Amino acid sequence: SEDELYRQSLEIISRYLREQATGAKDTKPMGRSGATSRKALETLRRVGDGVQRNHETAFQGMLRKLDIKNEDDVKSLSRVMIHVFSDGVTNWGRIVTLISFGAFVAKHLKTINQESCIEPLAESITDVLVRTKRDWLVKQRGWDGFVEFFH
Numbered sequence: 235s236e237d238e239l240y241r242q243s244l245e246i247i248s249r250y251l252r253e254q255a256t257g258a259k260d261t262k263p264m265g266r267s268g269a270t271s272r273k274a275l276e277t278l279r280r281v282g283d284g285v286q287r288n289h290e291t292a293f294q295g296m297l298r299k300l301d302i303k304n305e306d307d308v309k310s311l312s313r314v315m316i317h318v319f320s321d322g323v324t325n326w327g328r329i330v331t332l333i334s335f336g337a338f339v340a341k342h343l344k345t346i347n348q349e350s351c352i353e354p355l356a357e358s359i360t361d362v363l364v365r366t367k368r369d370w371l372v373k374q375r376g377w378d379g380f381v382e383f384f385h
């Protein structure tokens with residue numbers, strides 16, 4: 235507790251992954267910094283859906299290489315994301331791609347009756363993002379900078 239960037243990041247990524255997987259939109263209000271979290275999630279529905287639709291073939295190719303089947307295969311994805319995501323350049327384009335790929339995997343997890351793995355997947359993405367890019371996210375004004383960037 236007393237890490238608002240982490241709390242706000244978890245809220246936005248977890249809601250996106252669950253909405254993408256199930257189709258149900260959460261009507262429950264956002265916590266502290268509501269305006270920003272709603273806009274961020276609206277941005278993700280536009281830009282995130284756009285990445286998955288536009289690059290379906292590349293996403294399907296990667297999903298098949300990673301061969302996700304169960305909780306163990308999801309736990310394994312964290313190491314891949316550190317290597318693929320964290321060890322590349324940092325920009326909102328790559329951040330949206332990571333979260334979009336999470337949504338792509340979450341839809342995959344729903345289709346194989348592995349919904350229980352969607353929350354850990356969301357936790358793992360948020361940890362990779364916030365733990366490895368903390369100072370960059372702060373410099374870029376966090377989720378307010380994300381919304382302004384993709385306006």
Ligand SMILES: CCc1sc2ncnc(N[C@H](Cc3ccccc3)C(=O)O)c2c1-c1cccc2[nH]ccc12
Binds near residue numbers: 285289292296322329
């Ligand atoms: C673990 C899956 C991840 S996390 C991740 N985090 C950031 N960026 C990524 N991709 C962009 C390249 C890119 C752009 C649009 C569509 C598809 C790919 C980048 O690296 O700049 C990926 C990937 C990823 C997913 C699917 C195929 C992939 N090919 C190489 C990475 C990658």
